[PDB]
């Protein structure tokens, strides 16, 4: 038994809910929240700017130190940093940004990062301002992640479409 509430079960290991991932993290304080990061860990918008805003910019301060030491992530890659006031840990995962010409095939590599963690609160990778088809992202998630993933879908209209179209 874990602390997640109100999720629809899609598979053995994948759960989904119409929820603001930033709001959900504040309530649940999960072990791992996933950020929709870019390779620079520049948390301007979407999930990263809202999680970063919810940390009062502490996520960005930590991320800048990480990049100064390590250089940029790979598209499809990840790093584990603090979860600040939202979670124990934040797994920053870089899905391909379709609006920058990145190979959508890297979405599977991105979701493979989730398998290093037993339970995660996550958004749909490469969805929103990263420009991918969220229906595709949910299919790759289901077909790639084997650990227990709690998906928060901010858009109520999209949530309903994801559920009603799910195979
Ligand atoms: C504030 S939560 C958030 C923001 C932007 C997004 O695209 C998503 C989402 O895609 O689930 C969620």
From Swiss-Prot:
Domain Macro: 1-167
Catalysed reactions, semicolon-separated: Thiol-dependent hydrolysis of ester, thioester, amide, peptide and isopeptide bonds formed by the C-terminal Gly of ubiquitin (a 76-residue protein attached to proteins as an intracellular targeting signal)
Subcellular location: Host endoplasmic reticulum membrane
Annotated control of activity: Inhibited in vitro by GRL-0617.
Membrane-topology annotation of the record: Multi-pass membrane protein
Domain of life where this protein originates: Viruses
Self-association state and partner proteins as the record states: May form homohexamers. Interacts with N protein.
Function, in words: Responsible for the cleavages located at the N-terminus of the replicase polyprotein. Participates together with nsp4 in the assembly of virally-induced cytoplasmic double-membrane vesicles necessary for viral replication. Antagonizes innate immune induction of type I interferon by blocking the phosphorylation, dimerization and subsequent nuclear translocation of host IRF3. Also prevents host NF-kappa-B signaling. In addition, PL-PRO possesses a deubiquitinating/deISGylating activity and processes both 'Lys-48'- and 'Lys-63'-linked polyubiquitin chains from cellular substrates.
Protein name stated in the entry: Papain-like protease nsp3
Organism lineage: Viruses, Riboviria, Orthornavirae, Pisuviricota, Pisoniviricetes
Residues of the full protein shown: 1025 to 1191 of 7096
């Amino acid at each position: 038994v874990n602390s997640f509430s109100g999720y629809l079960k899609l598979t053995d290991n994948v759960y989904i809910k119409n929820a603001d991932i930033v709001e959900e993290a504040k309530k649940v304080k999960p072990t791992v929240v996933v950020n929709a990061a870019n390779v620079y860990l520049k948390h301007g918008g979407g999930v990263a700017g809202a999680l970063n805003k919810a940390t009062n910019n502490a996520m960005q301060v930590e991320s800048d130190d990480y990049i100064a030491t390590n250089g940029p992530l790979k598209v499809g890659g990840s790093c584990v940093l603090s979860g600040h006031n939202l979670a124990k840990h934040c797994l920053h995962v870089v899905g391909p940004n379709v609006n920058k010409g990145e190979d959508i095939q890297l979405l599977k590599s991105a979701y493979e990062n989730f398998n290093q963690h037993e339970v995660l609160l996550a958004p749909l990778l490469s969805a929103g301002i990263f420009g991918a088809d969220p229906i595709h992202s949910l299919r790759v998630c289901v077909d790639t992640v084997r650990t227990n993933v709690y998906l928060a879908v901010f858009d109520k209209n999209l949530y309903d479409k994801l559920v009603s179209s799910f195979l």
